[PDB]
Every structure is written in structure tokens, then in C-alpha cells.
Write a protein that binds this ligand. Sequence first.
Ligand SMILES: Cc1cc(/C=C/C#N)cc(C)c1Nc1ccnc(Nc2ccc(C#N)cc2)n1
Ligand SMILES: [Mg+2]
Lengths: 415, 556
Amino acid sequence: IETVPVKLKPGMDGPKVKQWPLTEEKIKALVEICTEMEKEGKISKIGPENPYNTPVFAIKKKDSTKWRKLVDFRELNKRTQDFWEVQLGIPHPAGLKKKKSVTVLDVGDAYFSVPLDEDFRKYTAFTIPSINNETPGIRYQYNVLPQGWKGSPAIFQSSMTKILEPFKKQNPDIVIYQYMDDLYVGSDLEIGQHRTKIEELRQHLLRWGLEPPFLWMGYELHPDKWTVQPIVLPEKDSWTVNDIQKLVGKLNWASQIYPGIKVRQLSKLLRGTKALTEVIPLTEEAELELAENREILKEPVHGVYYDPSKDLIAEIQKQGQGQWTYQIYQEPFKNLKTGKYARMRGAHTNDVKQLTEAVQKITTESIVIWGKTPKFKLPIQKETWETWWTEYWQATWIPEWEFVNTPPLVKLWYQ
Amino acid sequence: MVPISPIETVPVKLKPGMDGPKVKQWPLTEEKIKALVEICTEMEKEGKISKIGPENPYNTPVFAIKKKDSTKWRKLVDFRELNKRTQDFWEVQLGIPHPAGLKKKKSVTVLDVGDAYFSVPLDEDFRKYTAFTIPSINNETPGIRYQYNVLPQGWKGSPAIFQSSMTKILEPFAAQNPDIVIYQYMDDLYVGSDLEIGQHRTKIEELRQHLLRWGLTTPDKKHQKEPPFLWMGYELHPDKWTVQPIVLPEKDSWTVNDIQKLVGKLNWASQIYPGIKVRQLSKLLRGTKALTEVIPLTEEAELELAENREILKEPVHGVYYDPSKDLIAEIQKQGQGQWTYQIYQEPFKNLKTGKYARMRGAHTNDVKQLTEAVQKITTESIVIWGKTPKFKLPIQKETWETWWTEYWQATWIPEWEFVNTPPLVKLWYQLEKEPIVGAETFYVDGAANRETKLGKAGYVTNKGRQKVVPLTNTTNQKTELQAIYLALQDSGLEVNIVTDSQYALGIIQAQPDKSESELVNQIIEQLIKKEKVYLAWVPAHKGIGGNEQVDKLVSA
Ligand SMILES: Cc1cc(/C=C/C#N)cc(C)c1Nc1ccnc(Nc2ccc(C#N)cc2)n1
Ligand SMILES: [Mg+2]
């Protein structure tokens, strides 16, 4: 009912980001959404004395018939003061990643109930463009906490803890974590009981609401069963020269991650100048070294620790046939998580859709495990990514990314 | 009198921590002063400026400029200092419509709104910053001091505030009359419709009535300007559009600056004249920016110019957009990294044309370039029409499938069809995924001394074939490519090559079909002649047989 004062970081102006081209259907959708939001008092038209801008577009979330407005506040979030007036932080719950079921709820509509500090509103300016710029873009700013802004969950937090005080003491074994517009709710119940408690939770916020357009949805994760990818070596009865070269290459790479890896005896099987397809019998110094390397590879990497003050970096490789591998790390060769996907849905002829779904799944895992999003190194040309990713985006947050233009040799080793 | 709605003012601020201008007034001739006093008396009578006392400490210089070939003087207030200190505004013409996205209109009327152009009120709190002084005759009295009450021409905020004010006025008229379009440009309103001219002229009268609600009067004697409109370098007609006439000069000698003017005109022309090329003419501006230097024209640039003259021989027009029909985009390869395209809805009636040039890069191939051209056309089409066109591309469906399935990056192009118009984009080589049985295996290596720049490149094979070549003025990276080249040159149609060069592998895995490096180009030419090539990488200095042997041979 009263506004929390909000400022930008010192020596920092508001965002001035250029609105990217939107399709006709997204424009029409945003015109409808914003006409209603303006009637409901959530946004107001602004004049030319406001020079700021943040891009906007629209998405259709997973399994839906209704457009959702998505504001790309990445720049405003970088420029907004850090929030530890009341809380130095919400220390991330390490139990969330261990629950058998986690449901993700879009609770962003609750934020529209808190007014935004009148002096900060100007910095939330955005524009609905028109096709071919034939009419002036429609300019608005927020009067209430916007979805996607990092200040919104911070300012609403006191509210949110009060709404879920009942549900929490009634269900003390449920982990509830909030990230931006999402609520993550983890239980160890059977999925039918889980679905019930989720709907129980929905009722608390419908009741407090007295309508939220996307609260009824549920994105179900099972982090319980999230798989990793240790380094594994082939088990073969016949080794060609080429097989042993690939093995020595892979072990040389692994020795940067695992100190005690040796290739000397395996290398000695090469020595001659042999045909690549010739079969080489393994000597015993070689078989022993190989067995020793196998056992080293069953242990964890030494000195791997998560530092909350450092960025998480995510790298992705296209493996072919709808398969993608990825690694999350902060220091090179100190992977915090590795993984592999293949079930990229509805995209068997579209690489970029598959990559976009991978980015979203990796970001979701990152949020569950550490409570923040990684910076992506994407195997794609910037112009191709920037043209298409918004067509396949279904998440209400957006991570940061850069582009890999030189092919990594190490793709072979994660295959 | 009839009450008129006031136009709400836009609140305006100086940039943080800045004060208003305090600029000294230049002395003026007795003649100019008398002209400025009369000019300002009229302006004051109309309410555009007001006299102020000596309280106000701000000042902006005023000038009197003679209209060429007349006794009439003109008043110029130089707002350069106030503009540096005034806040930034939202500029709404951060994008002009492209004619190819416009819709055909039966009628377009122009209405003069100059009398609102100079009648939008200035924020009362900001007016003091606009103070200026007419100097007194002989400097024997205080100068006459005025400030602005309305948007001053030449002030940084006037175009944005005028446009936003006119837009707000027009918004309900446009909303309740969706069978017309309205466009504001300088001090004119352009109203188009498909209505029978009777209904059309009714709407125009209704628009004039609507404007009177704010006391904005429009001249009766209908506007001078009629279709065709000269606008932003185009000609707009009711049912077609073109660029304003492009005439390429004849010259015996071309300076840097003429070449820049020529390329600018060609670029402008390329949006409707198909096939325009500028590569060879742009190559002559490489590096140099000595704007009066004369440059000889290569035979290449002479040929490009000749081709362009033929393209520009007779006028070409575009049609307007029909939203009821699909958009089609067709692309052709032109050579030397140059691509050209046409966008149309009916065959032989282009909406617009254009071109795309290869990005500066060490290595490239046609498929990557076609892909980038497609993304650029896609984005331009979203801007202009709000949708992606269907593509007609000179690449077989099997070629694309092979490319995207095996390329190390994610890549995608939207819905498209093969069009069989040479030259076709093809894959010139594809490396094997597995070693080749029965093919000779070449273990290659090179090394160079960084001090002497002397090196060696060579290979050894499983058949005992061997070669080492001594090299001068070379580097480790060049000798590693040279070794791969020697193995390609000396092998049969199928070959296994083993290298430890991460550098060479990075290049070959990028699949270039053309390079700035002539050594890479020679490797590509050898790859094209093979039937099967398997390229295998091993780590250096690990006692890998064959690799260690030729490492010793070449690093000696
Ligand atoms: C951008 C624009 C510039 C001018 C004019 C600027 C001038 N100076 C005039 C108008 C009316 C417009 N706005 C639109 C919007 C949609 N379709 C059209 N079609 C259209 C416009 C002009 C002609 C002409 N004849 C024909 C069709 N114009
Ligand atoms: Mg070597």
C-alpha cells in the first residue's frame, strides 16, 4: 500500500535498450494485453520526456492458448541497486534439488498488487512498436511491481511470506523457493498427493487475490533423478590404431581435470607408422595403465567448490541426432554439473529450437541447484540466435549469453 | 468565443547538475537590431514570446540573417548551448516507414498544420532557460529581454514534443476512423484512404473539425503538394513507389569522394533496382580516407560500374504491400561474397529488392553466407511487414540437410523451397566420420624456428612414403597447414591424415570453401579433388607413432 524507495546503482542512468522487431501477431497480442493492464491501472502512457526503454515481447508458455507479456529487464536488473535492506539474501535452500517432485508456479501476477515507487517508474518504460513504424510506438511505464524485474520479488517478499505462513506450518516438509516470477515447490509425496498440495497452495493465493491468468499451470520437475556424465572410456576387445589415438586424446584431455592420468604405456602401442584401421593388441603395461586410468575416473574431481560470488558459466555442444551435452562451471576443468539431453521435443528438424529448449532446461537446473542463472556460451552465430530464440522461449526469465565461433575440439570427449 | 481544449505541456528538465545557458550576445548592426525588434514585437503580440525583467540570469544569442535576394531579415536564436544542457527525449522517428510496407491508397490529401507547429506551449518552469536579448541601439540602454512561451525552432526538445502532442490529438480520430491512415511529417498531415473521393473528403472535413477542438486552424486553399510525393529520397505514388532519380556521372578521373558518392547512390538504388553490385567499387576505398585522392579504377571496378549503368538505364518501380497475400523472398548468389534478393507477392512485381555482402572474415563458405543473408532478410521483413517471407533459395534440399545435420553449430533457416537458378550453393567437400579401410595413412607435421623463420613440413605413411620440405619465412601454424597440403597432394583419391595441429583442425572443422590464406585455398582445392578424406587429430609430444617420427624429421 506504501512504496519502498528504490534507486539505481551510483553513477548509472536508466536503460536505453532498442526495441527489437516484433511480428504482427505479437504486436496485436501486446496491444490487447496492455490495453487491459492500462484500464486496471498497472501501466500508464508516458510522454517524450521519458527517454528510457526496455524491450518487450510475448510468449506462449508451455501448453497454453494465451499470450504472456515478457519484458526483457536484463539491463534494468543490472543497473538496479542491490537489495539487502531487510535481507542480506534468501540463503538458497540446498534441499530443493533433493526432492522427488518440484512444481514451478507462475506467481508473477501477485506483484501487480504492490505500487512501484513513483520516482523509479520512469525506468520501466517500454514501447509497443508498430509494423513498418507507420504509427508512433505506444509508450508505457509501470505503476506497480513489474514481472521480470529483480526488485519485484525483493519488495514483495514480506507480503509473500505472510500469504504462505499457513501452508508452511501445515506442511513443514515442503520446500518453497521463489526465483523472479516463479515459485518452486518441492515434495517427497507421491505425484497425486503432490498435485493436491500444489492445488492446495494455489488456493491460498486465489484467496489472498480476493484473476491470475497463468497461476493454474504447473511445470513438474523430478530433480531426484537428474543425471550427470562422468568421464567413461571404451571397453573393447579389438583396438584399432585409430581407437587408441582417440583414447590417448581423450585421456590427455582428462589429465587436465584428473592429475594422475597416464598415457605413456598406451602411447607405446603407437610407435610404428601404422594404418589407422589396423588392430593393435594391448600389451600389459598398456592394459594396466588403462585400468588405473579407469579407476581414477570413478572419483570426483579434486578442489571443486561453488562460490556464490562468482558467475556460473554454461557450455553446450551439439552432438547430432537431437543430442546435446553441457557443462556448468566457474573455473575451467572444475565442473559443478555436467549433463546430456536427447528428448528435445517438437524440434527434430530445427536445431535452434532444440538449443533454445536446452538453454531453458539448463537455466532451470541452475536455479534449483544454486538459485541463479548461468551465462551461456552458445554454439551458434549471433545473427541466427538473435533472429529466432524469442520464437521458442517459454520461460519468464532470460539469462545472459555469448557466442562460440570456433569449433571446440573437446566436443569429441563429451560425446 | 468557442472554448478550446488546452494542450497539456510536457515537463522538461536540464541534464542533472547542469544549469541553463549564460552566453554573451554578439554586437549587431543598427540595421539588424531594428529588424529584430519588429520581428519580436509581432511574435510577442501573437504570444510566442514574453518580455522579462533583469532577474533572469540566462541568455542565448540571437542573430539576424538576410534572406538571400530580399530586403527581409530573419531571426535566428542559436540554441546550441541550451541543447547541450537539455535532457534527452524519446525520439519517435527512430525509424521511418519503408515504402514497400505501405498499402496502396486511392486518395492521399495533405493538410498544413504549420500554425500548430509554432503554437505548442513550453513547460512554464523551463521557459526561463530560453531567455535571449536584443542589443540596444548604440548600447546606451539595457537590451530588450524575452523568453519563449512556445516550442522554439532549433531547440532540442521541439520536434519530439511537437510530434507527441500532435499524436495525442490525432489518436482518437484515427481510432474511430480505421478506414484511413494519418502520417505527420514536418508541419504536414497526410491522410490516405480507399474511400470514394466523396467519403474521403468528408473525413478530411471531419478531421479539420476535430483539430479545431484545440484551436488548430488549417488553411482552406487546398495544399500545393499532390501525388507523387518526394519524401525521404523516394517517390510515393498512389499505387507504386520508387527511389528518386539515380544518375551516375561520367568522369575521366574519380576521387575518393566521388567514389563514396557513387557507392552511396548505388546502395540507395539497390532497394528497388535488382542486381546492383558495389564490391569492386568499395574495394577502392580500402583503408584510405584522403578524401581528395584520385584512385585508378581497376578493370574489375570498371566492369561493375558498366553493369550498374545497364541496370539503371530505365526507371523501375515497386508495388505496395497486400496483407492478404504471402510474401516471397528470392535470393541469388552474385560472386565475391555478394548476394542479391527480391521480395514479391505476385510474380514479376517486386515490393522491394536488396543486397547482402559477405562479412569480413579469415575463412567462409557459401552456405554460411546464404544463411546470414536469410537471417538479414527475415529481420528486415519483420520490420517492414511483421512476418517472415517464404524463401526461394539456390540450394538443393539434400545439400541443406547434409549441412545442418553435420555442422558443429546449431543452424536453421525458415520455410523455403529450392529454386533451380545457377549458380547453386553446394557442399564442395565433406570429411569422413570414420577412418577409411585400405586408404594410405599420412602422419603429417611441421615446425618453424620463430627467430630464423625457417621451418620444415612433411609426412610419413604406413607404406613407407615420406616427404620433408624445407621452408623459409614461415611460422609453426603455416608449416602445419603446409604438411596437410603435402599429404593431400601426394595421396590417392582416398586418404587418412593424422595431424596434431589444433589450429589446422579448427580451420578445417569450420568447413571453408574460400580463404584469405592462399595456403588454405590450396588445401580446399585438394580436398575437392578427393573421393574420401578422414582427418584425425592426436596430441603432440606424446610419443604417438608416426607422429613422433615426423615431428623429429621436421623440428630438426
Ligand atoms: C508513411 C506515410 C507517408 C506519407 C507521405 C509522405 C510525403 N511526403 C503519407 C502517408 C499516408 C504515410 N502513411 C501510410 C501508411 C500506410 N499506407 C500508406 N500508403 C500510401 C502512402 C502514400 C501514397 C502516395 N501516393 C500511397 C500509398 N501510407
Ligand atoms: Mg610437433
